[PDB]
Amino acid sequence: GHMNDALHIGLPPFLVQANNEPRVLAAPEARMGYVLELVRANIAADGGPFAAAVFERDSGLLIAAGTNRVVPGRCSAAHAEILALSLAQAKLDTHDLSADGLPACELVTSAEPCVMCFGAVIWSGVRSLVCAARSDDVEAIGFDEGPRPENWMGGLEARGITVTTGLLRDAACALLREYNAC
Amino acid sequence: MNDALHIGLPPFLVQANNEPRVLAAPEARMGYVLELVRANIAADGGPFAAAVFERDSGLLIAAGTNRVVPGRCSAAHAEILALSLAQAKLDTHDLSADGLPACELVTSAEPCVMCFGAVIWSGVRSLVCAARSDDVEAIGFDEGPRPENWMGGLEARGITVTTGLLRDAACALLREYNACNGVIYNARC
Ligand SMILES: Nc1nc(N)c2nc[nH]c2n1
Ligand SMILES: [Zn+2]
Ligand SMILES: [Zn+2]
């Protein structure tokens, strides 16, 4: 809500809980299954059908999670990725996730990022991005990726951020089609 | 806050966002945005400020400055703060929602790729910049990989773009931040 002295984006109960309960998920598909549970919880708490979480890349320790809170939060910058990366940085007391001595961080996200989130992933210091639904899956339910540069993935890769896509794509599309139906 | 995204605003920014203010001329709007750059640098933030104004009346809606380092948040560019704070005050994610005056983002520098998408999603109908991307990069800030013809990109979404407005003063402030950036104490800073 509106504050005088802060930008303040409140989080619904499931998301506060997700950011404060201990969770180590070693396998990539474990990490992505949990992110898709957050998608489902978010849809039920009036949010867009997107979620993301920052994990320690090797251990799979969950550091923070975010979901689309654009409409209920009255904030167009409130995509899953922005919240997940920002909360991870708050937790780790730094604006730079690749700060010396911090373990390598990974953003596991329900769908390929829009142009804003593409830039946010670059500045964040995460070293790895893993996506489920593809860009055309997102467009097919009326979400816009915006004008991203051509070869956005190679843009990430050239800056030391490894990119995997398509992970539990079909599971993520099931939740997208469902949001679009309702 | 582990229960919210919470970026605190320094007092001078609370002040900027508290007092009613109307600036008709583009140069007046950018003059004010450049005062916030200097106040931000003195309040431990980066050399970047932006403000959302009603396009046709000059009424200030909200201002934002770069709070990346003090706010421990790489998303906290001036543009993201200005836009989000304006959306919070008017109680919509969409600055072009029915009933709302057309909004213009005035920004001390051309937007990086993240801020470029934020602009597109925000609903503002006008982007007005001072320093060019070349200026920003000249002192080690990185605009990142924007799409080819990013300005044409904005225009095709109906977002009119101006740049170079009070560019000299904005460059002078960038160079002054850069001269004071190092670790060796300089009383002149
Ligand atoms: N316009 C602009 N460009 C950057 N690289 C940047 N980094 C932090 N704030 C910024 N603003
Ligand atoms: Zn996004
Ligand atoms: Zn930016």
From TrEMBL, chain B:
Q: Which domain of life is it from?
A: Bacteria
| UniProt keyword Metal-binding present | yes
Locate the residues binding Zn(2+).
H77, E79, C112, C115
For the ligand (cytidine), the binding residues are F48, N66, D142, E143
Q: List the InterPro entries.
A: APOBEC/CMP_deaminase_Zn-bd, CMP_dCMP_dom, Cytidine_deaminase-like
Q: Does the keyword S-adenosyl-L-methionine apply?
A: no
| Name of the protein described by the UniProt record | Cytidine and deoxycytidylate deaminase zinc-binding region
- Native organism is Nitrosomonas europaea (strain ATCC 19718 / CIP 103999 / KCTC 2705 / NBRC 14298)
